[PDB]
Amino acid sequence: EEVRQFRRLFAQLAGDDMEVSATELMNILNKVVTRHPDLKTDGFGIDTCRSMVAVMDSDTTGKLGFEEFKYLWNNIKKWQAIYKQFDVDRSGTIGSSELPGAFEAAGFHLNEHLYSMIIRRYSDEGGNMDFDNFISCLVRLDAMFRAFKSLDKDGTGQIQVNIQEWLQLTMYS
Amino acid sequence: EEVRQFRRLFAQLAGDDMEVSATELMNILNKVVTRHPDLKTDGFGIDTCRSMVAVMDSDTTGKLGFEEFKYLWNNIKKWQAIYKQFDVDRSGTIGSSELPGAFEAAGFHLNEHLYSMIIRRYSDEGGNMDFDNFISCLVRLDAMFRAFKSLDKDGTGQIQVNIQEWLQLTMYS
Ligand SMILES: O=C(O)[C@@H](S)Cc1ccc(I)cc1
Ligand SMILES: O=C(O)[C@@H](S)Cc1ccc(I)cc1
Ligand SMILES: [Ca+2]
Ligand SMILES: [Ca+2]
Ligand SMILES: [Ca+2]
Ligand SMILES: [Ca+2]
Numbered sequence: 001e002e003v004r005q006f007r008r009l010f011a012q013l014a015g016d017d018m019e020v021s022a023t024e025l026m027n028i029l030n031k032v033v034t035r036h037p038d039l040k041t042d043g044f045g046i047d048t049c050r051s052m053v054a055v056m057d058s059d060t061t062g063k064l065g066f067e068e069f070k071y072l073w074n075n076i077k078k079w080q081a082i083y084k085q086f087d088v089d090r091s092g093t094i095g096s097s098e099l100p101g102a103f104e105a106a107g108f109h110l111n112e113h114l115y116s117m118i119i120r121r122y123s124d125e126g127g128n129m130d131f132d133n134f135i136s137c138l139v140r141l142d143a144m145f146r147a148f149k150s151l152d153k154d155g156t157g158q159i160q161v162n163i164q165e166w167l168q169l170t171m172y173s
Numbered sequence: 174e175e176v177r178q179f180r181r182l183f184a185q186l187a188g189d190d191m192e193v194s195a196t197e198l199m200n201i202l203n204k205v206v207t208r209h210p211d212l213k214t215d216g217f218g219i220d221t222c223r224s225m226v227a228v229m230d231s232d233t234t235g236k237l238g239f240e241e242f243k244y245l246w247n248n249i250k251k252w253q254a255i256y257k258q259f260d261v262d263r264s265g266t267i268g269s270s271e272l273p274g275a276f277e278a279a280g281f282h283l284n285e286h287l288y289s290m291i292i293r294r295y296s297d298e299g300g301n302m303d304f305d306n307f308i309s310c311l312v313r314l315d316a317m318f319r320a321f322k323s324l325d326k327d328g329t330g331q332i333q334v335n336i337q338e339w340l341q342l343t344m345y346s
């Protein structure tokens with residue numbers, strides 16, 4: 001079945017310690033993104049991969065276990081289609097005007113100010129965002145949203161943290 | 174004088190828009206780190222440089238103005254000496270056991286748990302941290318500390334933020 005062979009794929013990629021490290025993730029991500037040329041990218045760099053891993057490392061093993069990796073993979077599959085769908089000009093990248101729809105389709109409703117911050121940090125001098133940047137951003141964004149909600153189950157619209165929780169959440173990303 | 178020629182150096186590097194972008198920073202950082210072989214590194218990647226810039230972008234111009242760049246440069250100069258000083262085994266990298274002293278000398282007192290998170294995210298499979306990782310971490314750490322203090326001038330040991338401040342602070346880094 002599908003679930004069957006994916007479980008094997010993970011075991012195979014995880015290797016010796018049975019979890020996927022940043023280096024492992026980076027290698028598989030690159031090799032795969034190469035088969036999809038319609039997704040322009042300068043590649044997944046090691047640093048970007050270390051951020052995605054840490055931000056996905058809920059059990060703080062330093063690496064990705066099966067579920068974490070599964071969560072991340074599905075997300076990438078989904079965000080991958082949304083990327084192509086919204087690249088209406090077939091530039092291979094997500095433009096400043098295509099982004100909002102892309103993010104919203106993915107399920108993230110941001111306001112003008114947040115979108116501008118996103119462009120500034122994850123898009124190029126031309127307001128364009130390649131694929132590794134797009135995926136990297138959504139992973140982090142999705143994770144920051146979840147972190148917020150979990151610390152505000154009482155839904156007051158505000159979370160309160162001491163300096164150690166803060167550093168943990170901001171440095172481990 | 175010294176202040177005189179540094180002001181020229183910035184103007185020269187900033188170029189057309191007169192601020193230093195991530196690409197500009199990355200180029201100057203690399204070219205410089207090359208003259209210092211005692212500082213092992215696989216280089217400053219574009220993504221790492223985009224994080225340092227954003228985290229240093231207090232006025233949100235998307236790039237580094239003179240003061241921001243000056244602040245960052247002094248820090249690097251200082252953290253650069255602390256790096257060499259504490260690399261007692263002349264490995265060219267900062268080891269798991271040399272880190273605490275290095276960070277503390279720099280002025281950051283963390284606890285066992287925070288140090289472990291740091292190693293996990295910024296050190297290699299061998300618990301080693303190269304120079305671009307070391308500088309990158311301190312810049313972010315220093316910035317996260319400042320962000321916390323500014324939001325807690327009443328010194329209650331806690332800061333409270335809504336979802337937009339949160340996303341701004343976590344995504345723009
Ligand atoms: O072609 C595939 O295997 C799939 S599931 C879609 C996909 C496209 C790009 C990446 I990177 C990862 C996954
Ligand atoms: O040799 C120099 O110019 C100096 S100030 C120290 C330094 C060393 C490494 C970096 I990257 C930046 C600055
Ligand atoms: Ca592994
Ligand atoms: Ca994990
Ligand atoms: Ca496009
Ligand atoms: Ca990229």
Ligand SMILES: [Ca+2]
Nearest residue numbers: 187188192194
């Ligand atoms: Ca410039």
Ligand SMILES: [Ca+2]
Nearest residue numbers: 230234236238
């Ligand atoms: Ca600025």
Ligand SMILES: [Ca+2]
Nearest residue numbers: 260264266268
């Ligand atoms: Ca050392």
Ligand SMILES: [Ca+2]
Nearest residue numbers: 215303305306
């Ligand atoms: Ca490095």
